[PDB]
């Protein structure tokens, strides 16, 4: 499960939103108004998806494998950029692996949903065609399927 590092955490300085608390798909990350530091409110409901870790001020959040099956010592640390992500995998025995994978081939926020699509028409609304079809499918025409004789 995830856990916040006190030393690096700053309860999200003056930004507009708490990254960790905003991203968690299971509503686990929250703030303790007193310490002004975040924490996982229900670790046994953590999927270890690393969303919080990736979206926070680097090093503020890490993951410690579920105790049920995880000996101490292991760690996977992500460094998510804009076109790729870097990973460091540290074994209990000291071994250290480093990887880097692409994550996106276009600029963030650059999506034009219906780029090049013709306008919808009441007539087209009655066919099986979805937006952009049959062109986007790449075929010479809308894919046909043989019905059972």
């Amino acid at each position: 499960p995830s856990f916040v590092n006190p030393e690096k955490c700053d309860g999200c300085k003056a930004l507009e939103r708490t990254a960790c608390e905003y991203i968690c798909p299971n509503d686990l990350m929250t703030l303790d108004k007193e310490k002004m530091k975040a924490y996982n409110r229900e670790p046994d409901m953590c999927w270890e998806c690393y969303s919080c870790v990736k979206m926070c001020p680097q090093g503020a959040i890490d993951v410690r494998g579920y105790v049920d099956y995880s000996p101490l010592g292991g760690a996977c640390v992500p460094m998510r950029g804009t076109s790729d992500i870097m990973w460091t995998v540290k074994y209990r025995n000291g071994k250290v692996l480093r990887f880097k994978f692409a994550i996106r081939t276009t600029p963030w926020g650059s999506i034009q949903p219906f780029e090049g699509f013709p306008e919808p028409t009441e007539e087209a609304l009655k066919s099986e065609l979805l937006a952009g079809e049959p062109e986007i499918i790449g075929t010479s025409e809308f894919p046909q399927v043989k019905k059972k004789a």
Binding site: Y22, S70, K95
Partner: protein, 642 residues
């Protein structure tokens, strides 16, 4: 277990209501939901229709694709953009056979002819797809292609946001019940929910509602019950919300007995698809026997299914189960032999496939890489243990549980249209209510691309439905207030009875969400073919399950919650319990064992194509509190042969 730092209690009457009027309401902003939001936005213009997307968490990372994915499991490739081209007929055949003969081919062929378009858009949108030096999409197996998908959801979330507009996306809002048309008992009119960030009750009035809440997990006790109770293979975020609200509304369910048991790396549940199909990894028992070989003969009794290619997933699971019963564990994924074999002595080649191996995990199930790190397991040196997880109920993956939905007019046979008052693609038996992704049954193997696609399909059908039928549903204000009271009742019960005990979690007048959940999991595990009985059950066990679920259901009326987070947990529990009951009733109804490997009816151990080659559909009547079952014979819609 949950121990809130501080209380966050509100009484229903103290909570403000926010009414939201829209035309199309999408419940669930995961892959199917974003697919619906995207497509709906396109056609909605034809009538200036308002599209609204509600999500309990945040769309950027919500759902099963939170960590990203390492491949797109469904890409037909009708032109040759990948290393392998396929036909739609072969795909339909593949799915029907994997389902051991039972699949709504009109639904499968329908998403299959549209799916590639979706994938091409994903790439256009920035998703990096693995490519060969020749520029072809790299194939994993026959139907999948590898991707660098760490940001798979964020990208799809962006498309949806750009399509419908952030002002039409409500996040951190949990939907717990649907609203029906005061004017019509079998028509949807919206839904109700509440914020998990502040005291605010939501009432969504709509002409069409689309269920895209994902499937259901944590119904069964997992192989790890401490912190690792959170390491469910499938999305722990999906708790059968769609199943609950739809069945309560009277929408018919289908194949709800068809759960999915995933065979994955043990404990972490890392993916095996790439290892099996791409790296050609072998799975052997503790004695070094490749059981898909040694257990081949046992599949002979399942003709013709036992001879298909690939072999049906449940049957591959069955072979694993036989090894487990014989005591031949641990079962190993020999990654060390796979990597050596593939690299062929070339150290630089080894380094490359070694990076691909780790990406397969780091791109979608980091826990598995972390598990290897904690246990000092280097895949190039030693094998990894594998095992089947507890059951999950969903309709987008290898399981086909979900609502009985209508198909396209050009593919759906008369045999499958009888239960639908209105014939609109992906609409349930309830008018105006659609179901997609995990929520739509009888057409599995959709996965990421297919679920997004099914969402598009229902979205267009919803716009068509609105413009053609021109509905004007009216919500019952009396029902709304009742639901609002029920919504926060758990918090009011806590305040009303916490004084009976000096410990908040040990009270005689109420149960907290985690307590009811532990109980549900134990019941399902011990009586509904969970891991406890190695997925075996029978009439008597299932009947006892119903008696125990009845006790639990009654105790839900005494649920308590100490804060908004736990209030959501309380309703997620309610959703799971009803989902669990439906699963049990379905398993009890089908007197056969069609998917050994997923579950076994020891009292009806054989597959029965003479009397059970049919979809099992059911309806729950809330007013009468009665469950009705119906058998719909399977008919081959698409041309194909074994």
């Amino acid at each position: 277990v949950y121990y809130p730092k501080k209380y966050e209690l509100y009484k229903a009457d103290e909570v403000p209501t926010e009414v939201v009027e829209t035309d199309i309401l999408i419940i669930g902003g995961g892959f199917s939901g974003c697919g619906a939001a995207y497509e709906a936005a396109y056609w909605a213009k034809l009538g200036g229709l308002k599209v609204t997307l509600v999500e309990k968490a945040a769309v950027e990372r919500s759902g099963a694709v939170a960590q990203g994915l390492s491949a797109i499991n469904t890409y037909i490739d009708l032109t040759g953009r990948s290393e392998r081209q396929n036909t739609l007929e072969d795909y339909v055949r593949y799915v029907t056979l994997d389902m051991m003969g039972l699949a709504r081919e009109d639904l499968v062929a329908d998403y299959a002819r549209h799916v590639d378009g979706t994938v091409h858009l994903f790439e256009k949108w920035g998703l990096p797809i693995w490519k060969t030096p020749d520029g072809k999409y790299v194939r994993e197996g026959q139907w999948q292609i590898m991707i660098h998908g760490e940001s798979y959801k964020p990208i799809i979330a962006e498309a949806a946001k750009m399509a419908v507009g952030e002002e039409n996306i409500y996040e951190r809002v949990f939907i717990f019940e649907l609203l029906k048309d005061k004017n019509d008992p079998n028509a949807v009119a919206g839904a109700v929910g509440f914020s998990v960030r502040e005291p605010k009750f939501y009432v969504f009035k709509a002409k069409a509602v689309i269920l895209a809440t994902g499937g259901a997990t944590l119904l069964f006790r997992p192989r790890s019950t401490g912190e690792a109770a959170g390491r469910t293979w499938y999305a722990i975020f999906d708790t059968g919300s769609g199943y609950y609200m739809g069945l309560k509304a009277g929408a018919m369910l289908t194949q709800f007995e068809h759960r999915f048991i995933p065979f994955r790396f043990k404990d972490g549940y890392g993916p095996v698809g790439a290892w099996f199909l791409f790296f050609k990894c072998k799975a052997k028992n503790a004695y070094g026997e490749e059981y898909i070989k040694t257990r081949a003969a046992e599949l002979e009794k399942y003709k013709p299914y036992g001879a298909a290619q690939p072999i049906p997933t449940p049957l591959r699971n069955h072979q694993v189960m036989l090894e487990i019963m014989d005591g031949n564990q641990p079962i190993y994924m020999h990654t060390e032999e796979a990597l050596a074999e593939l690299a062929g002595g070339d150290k630089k080649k080894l380094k490359h496939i070694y990076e691909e191996a780790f990406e397969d995990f780091l791109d979608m199930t980091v826990s598995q890489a972390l598990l290897w790190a904690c246990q000092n397991i280097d895949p190039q040196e030693q094998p990894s243990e594998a095992a089947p997880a507890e059951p999950y109920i969903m309709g987008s993956h290898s399981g086909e549980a979900g609502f009985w939905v209508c198909g396209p007019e050009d593919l759906m046979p008369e045999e499958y249209a009888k239960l639908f008052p209105l014939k609109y693609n992906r609409m349930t038996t309830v008018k105006g209510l659609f179901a997609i992704g995990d929520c739509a049954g009888a057409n599995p193997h959709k996965f990421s691309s297919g679920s997004f696609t099914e969402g598009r399909i229902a979205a267009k059908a919803a716009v068509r439905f609105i413009l053609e039928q021109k509905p004007n549903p009216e919500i019952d204000d009396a029902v709304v207030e009742e639901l609002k009271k029920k919504a926060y009742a758990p918090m009011e019960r806590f305040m009303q009875y916490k004084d009976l005990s000096t410990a908040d979690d040990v009270n005689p007048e109420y149960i907290l969400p985690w307590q009811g959940l532990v109980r549900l999991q134990k019941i399902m595990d011990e009586y509904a073919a969970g891991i406890a009985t190695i997925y075996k059950t029978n009439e008597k066990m299932l009947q006892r399950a119903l008696e125990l679920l009845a006790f639990l259901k009654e105790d839900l009326e005494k649920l308590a919650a100490r804060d908004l987070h736990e209030l959501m947990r309380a309703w997620e529990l309610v959703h799971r319990v009803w989902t669990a009951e439906a699963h049990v009733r379905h398993m009890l109804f089908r007197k056969e064992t069609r998917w050994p490997g997923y579950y076994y009816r020891t009292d009806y151990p054989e597959l029965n194509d003479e009397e059970w080659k049919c979809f099992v559909c059911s309806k729950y009547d809330a007013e009468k509190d009665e469950w009705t079952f119906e058998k719909v014979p399977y008919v081959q819609v698409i041309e194909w042969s074994f």
